[PDB]
């Protein structure tokens, strides 16, 4: 996938500058519907232009539209982490899918 490679490359570029400057997102199981999960968890980051291309690139892999402000849960077992940690985690999962084919 060229699309997959482009996304990996964009994540590498943006996390090589602390990604979204003190914004926190909830973790998720990324092993199950990874792309939509990552978009769902990243769609509500509100003042970070560095993540916009990432958000658009992720939308290309999700087979439904991902809108901001939607209810998921109260995230009881989940945990707030930095966008950068989330994105670096996401990158690992994406590299494996690349490697798997």
């Amino acid at each position: 996938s060229t699309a997959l490679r482009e996304l990996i490359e964009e994540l590498v570029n943006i996390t090589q500058a602390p990604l979204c400057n003190g914004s926190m997102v909830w973790s998720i199981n990324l092993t199950a519907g990874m792309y939509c999960a990552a978009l769902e968890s990243l769609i509500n980051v509100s003042g970070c232009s560095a993540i916009e291309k990432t958000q658009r690139m992720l939308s290309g892999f999700c087979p439904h539209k991902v809108s901001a402000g939607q209810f998921s849960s109260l995230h009881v077992r989940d945990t707030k982490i930095e966008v950068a940690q989330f994105v670096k985690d996401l990158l690992l999962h994406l590299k494996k899918l690349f490697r798997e084919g």
């Epitope: 060229t2 490679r5 990996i8 590299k95 494996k96 690349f98 490697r99 798997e100 084919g101």
Partner: antibody
Framework: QVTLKESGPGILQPSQTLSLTCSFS??????????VGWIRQPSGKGLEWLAH???????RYNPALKSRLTISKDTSGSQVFLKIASVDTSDTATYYC?????????????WGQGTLVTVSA | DVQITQSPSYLAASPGETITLNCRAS??????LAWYQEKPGKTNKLLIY???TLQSGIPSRFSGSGSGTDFTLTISSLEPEDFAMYFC?????????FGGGTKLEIKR
Amino acid sequence: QVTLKESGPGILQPSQTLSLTCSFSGFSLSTYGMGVGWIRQPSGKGLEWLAHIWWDDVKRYNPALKSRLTISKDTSGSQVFLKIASVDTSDTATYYCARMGSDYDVWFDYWGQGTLVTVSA
Amino acid sequence: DVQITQSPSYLAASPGETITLNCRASKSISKYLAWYQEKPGKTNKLLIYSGSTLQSGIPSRFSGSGSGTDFTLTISSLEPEDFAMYFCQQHNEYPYTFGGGTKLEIKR
């Protein structure tokens, strides 16, 4: 520093199963980002990618040979193995193992010297 | 499945010359081409990857260029140790495929 070295049968009869070993120093296939592939060159012809394996056991195989190939590593991640089932004379080649220069992408930063395998009666 | 052509497959040049080698893919490979140097009794040496990225510890007189389907390796001011067989490999797409090489030999 990083070295790789192939070991093989030298010669085998057709319909046999070629077993190749790659031994290496200066890295382990239990470290993140590490992986090893097998590439071959029939004489006066070009290189042909066969298979590769990563530290987390993700494997890929050349679809033209997919069924005949099995790649593995040991639990100490210090050797890598290729099996080619049902060899014929088209499998006569020099066989190289090589380390991947990236944690996801497939180009090779270090190569072994190669070993000749002749498949003949 | 991408076929890689290196043409011409033979070149002669005198030291100090600047030369270019061609590598052509049968379909676009974005920028993902690697170049390797091959020498008798030596292990193959990676020079460039992703079209233009110089491997660590390789002299900067090696320069890779191109994108899509047409690629070049330029070696400027050839040193004696620079004469060798040079082959390319696309790493855009599985299965990975190699060009048939160009032998660069010294004119004397």
